[PDB]
């Protein structure tokens, strides 16, 4: 019902732009490295779970650098590392 492909290249958009455009700010940068790993990860397996957290981290690292918000930066990388911990156990129980 929504376009999760078009989510996904967003996702990787967002986080790419953050990476070039945040050289001095850690949090920004290590948010948006998990983002793109976890698009790998959800282009891989396709669980619609995975997909939703690798989304709503990229909202977020979104909404930090439009607003300036950098907390959210810290929740975007934990929502990344949920992402790739829940690729994690697709590999482990499937």
């Known amino acids: 019902g929504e376009d999760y ?3 996904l290249e ?7 732009e953050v990476l070039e455009n945040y050289p001095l700010t850690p949090v920004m940068r290590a948010a948006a490295r998990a983002i793109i ?8 397996y396709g669980d619609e779970e995975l997909i ?4 709503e981290a990229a909202r977020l690292l979104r909404q930090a ?8 930066a810290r929740q975007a990388l934990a929502a ?3 992402a790739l911990a829940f690729a994690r156990r697709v590999a482990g129980l499937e």
């Open 5 to 7: 492909l078009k989510l």
């Open 10 to 16: 967003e996702a990787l958009k967002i986080a790419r």
């Open 37 to 44: 790993e976890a698009v790998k990860m959800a282009k891989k």
């Open 52 to 55: 939703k957290l690798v989304v």
């Open 65 to 72: 650098a439009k607003q300036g918000d950098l907390e959210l």
């Open 80 to 82: 990344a590392r949920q």
